[PDB]
């Protein structure tokens, strides 16, 4: 059966983030995949897995505006103001795309230092419970590149993720009680 393979079981390409901004001015979203409880529960079934991202950014506005989307891996600095000199740095993946074009697409390869992502980490960092310092990937910062037109803007950004090239290890029983937070697995 070609349907039930794990490479086909986790390739849904669902939404993860949707946060608009009105014309702080730039959108910064962490890459943690524990955003929606629909996708989070499907990743609870496996202990260790390994994949790549394939980010797609869809943008609609309420006009020939140009958008920059920069990916920043872990360890490098993240910008705090829109016109900062971190945006001009070329040691990180940036993509420049308009609104009128079809939406942008970029894939992010496997960047843990171990052999796989550790979904569950029964251990401590330094000295925190359940935080593996080699697990996190980075964050993508999306700003606009224009002088602002003093009219009514509403720029809404949607981000989609298709994890492909899946490999899985050690299946685990699913979660039946609803979540309390996204930091840990309370009930």
């Amino acid at each position: 059966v070609s349907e039930t393979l794990v490479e086909n079981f986790l390739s849904r390409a669902a939404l993860v983030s949707k946060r608009s901004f009105e014309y702080k001015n730039f959108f910064k979203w962490t890459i943690n995949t524990r955003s929606f409880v629909q996708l989070r529960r499907k990743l609870e079934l496996f202990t260790y897995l390994r994949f790549d991202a394939e980010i797609t950014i869809l943008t609609t506005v309420a006009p020939d505006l140009t958008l920059q989307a920069m990916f920043v891996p872990t360890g490098a600095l993240t910008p705090e103001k829109q016109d900062s000199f971190h945006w001009q740095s070329g040691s990180n993946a940036s993509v420049f795309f308009k609104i009128s074009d079809p939406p942008a697409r970029i894939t992010i390869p496997f960047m843990c230092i171990n052999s796989a992502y550790s979904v569950f980490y029964d251990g401590f960092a330094g000295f925190l419970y359940g935080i593996n310092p080699a697990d996190t990937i980075g964050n993508l910062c999306v700003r606009i590149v224009n002088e602002h037109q003093p009219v009514g803007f509403t720029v809404t950004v949607r981000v989609y993720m298709k994890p492909k090239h899946i490999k899985a290890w050690a299946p685990r029983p699913p979660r039946t009680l609803p979540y309390m937070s996204i930091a840990n697995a309370n009930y």
């Binding site: 059966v1 349907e3 039930t4 079981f9 629909q38 529960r41 029983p173 979660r175």
Partner: protein, 121 residues
């Protein structure tokens, strides 16, 4: 169950395994009547011997394997039990015993169309 809430079409043979957990000494018999969906579930024992049943005796055997014939899910079947004889235990062990039921699909179990789950909010 928790896997096949994701998919919406299923077909395959199921297997059930029961297990007794009383003392060493205790004996007594049980019957396990299976009823196809075309027949009603028998609430009396004398009609329950017509259907496919097996006489299980804890004592001689501590476990039992029951094969379910398969049927696809298209739009219901019952596995019931009956106390055959009264349980006899010695004076030293406790009277109350216990049963535990297991379940596992066979290798012809198949899933077709993937959907979201209604199980979690």
């Amino acid at each position: 169950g928790n896997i096949s809430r994701y998919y919406t079409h299923w077909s395959g043979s199921l297997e059930m395994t029961f297990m007794f957990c009383g003392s060493f000494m205790a004996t007594g018999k049980l019957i396990l009547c299976y009823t196809p969906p075309g027949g009603s579930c028998p609430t009396t024992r004398e009609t329950a011997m017509l259907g496919t049943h097996i006489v299980w005796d804890f004592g001689l055997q501590s476990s039992v394997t029951l094969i379910i014939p398969w049927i696809s899910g298209s739009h219901v079947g019952y596995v019931t039990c009956f106390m055959q004889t009264n349980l006899i235990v010695p004076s030293e062990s406790s009277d109350t015993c216990s049963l535990i039921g297991f379940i596992a699909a066979k290798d012809d179990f198949s899933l077709r169309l993937m959907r979201d789950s209604p199980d979690i909010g």
